[PDB]
């Protein structure tokens, strides 16, 4: 039944829905790695929490987390894994099974269907636009611009929602939210909040930078 | 929006002290103060203490005046 | 005075003046505001300040004629 | 021009001396400080010095502040 481990993650943030090489550079977790394999393959990464401690213990960690996949596995001989990953959906824990490793029963997975995407075809492009115009006018996020072409046909909200929030970067514990945040439109929500506050806060940088240069 | 403004025009002394200042900390007691907001606060004079405190920091270095509206 | 002196060497405490003649104000006992330039530390400041022990004998003069 | 030239030499000039004075003054007096901290002084007051310290330091020309700093 897919059982799964409960490997936190330590100072990055891993989307689900996204490829990304993921780093386990805790020299304590290699034990999880043989398991990792023992179990279909599958590996289960839980967001980075209250500050990292190299304490294993169920009270100080979360149910919550992405899941990934191992499509192939490079090593060096430094204690840290480099693992390329494909997440399909969130998985949650509700029976925790004390270790060394920690193992989690899992349970039926937490997915959603789109119906009616009308609606939804107008939200995409609000909230495509609300980035659009910030990553070409703001640029001290430095993000990527050649996809355009072929982000506009597709028409996903649950990938599409954690690709944007992968792109930009703002306040970990909102990241985690949208991370382990069953409600996919409140990650739309909240999304296209950060992106208008990063407008308006760009436009004051601009003109209170503009006012300085008026005032010299 | 507001509130989230009220935090990066926070962060905008921030800014103008992470060369100036080794610590900002002091500069964060009426940062942290910010809470009034949360402490009754009828809505009007919620919008006129955020409006007095968002904007009373002109200069964060010496400044009596400066310092002046920072006491009050 | 000479009482105080007498008292202060005779628990080995440390013996000093205050002036209270003058005094009508909190800044003169206080201190004044450090974000000006104009600036001076209260009298009781001093007398602390003079002392290099926690516990001095610490007088204050006349009460009578404060102001 | 001349003003301009002059600024930029005449300021300097001075700020050279003011960042040695700087270094001389209230960085020598904390250190004397520090010497008499070993009974654990509370360093808080210390600390709205530095805040002081940190802004005045960074302005080597004038800063009339870090005078009151320094006898403070």
Known sequence: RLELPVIPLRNTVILPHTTTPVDVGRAKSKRAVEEAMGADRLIFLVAQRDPEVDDPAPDDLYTWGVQAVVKQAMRLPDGTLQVMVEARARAQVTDYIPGPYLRARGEVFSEIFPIDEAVVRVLVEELKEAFEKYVANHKSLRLDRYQLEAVKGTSDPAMLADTIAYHATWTVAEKQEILELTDLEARLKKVLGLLSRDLERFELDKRVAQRVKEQM | ?72 | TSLGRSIARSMNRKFHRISLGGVRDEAEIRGHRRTYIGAMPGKLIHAMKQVGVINPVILLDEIDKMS
């Open chain 2, 1 to 72: 929006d507001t509130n989230q403004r009220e935090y990066y025009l926070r962060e905008q002394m921030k800014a103008i002290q992470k060369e100036l200042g080794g610590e900002d900390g002091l500069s964060d007691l009426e940062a942290l103060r910010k809470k009034i907001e949360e402490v009754g606060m009828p809505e009007a004079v919620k919008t006129k203490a955020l409006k007095e405190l968002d904007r009373l920091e002109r200069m964060q270095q010496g400044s009596p005046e400066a310092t002046v509206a920072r006491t009050y």
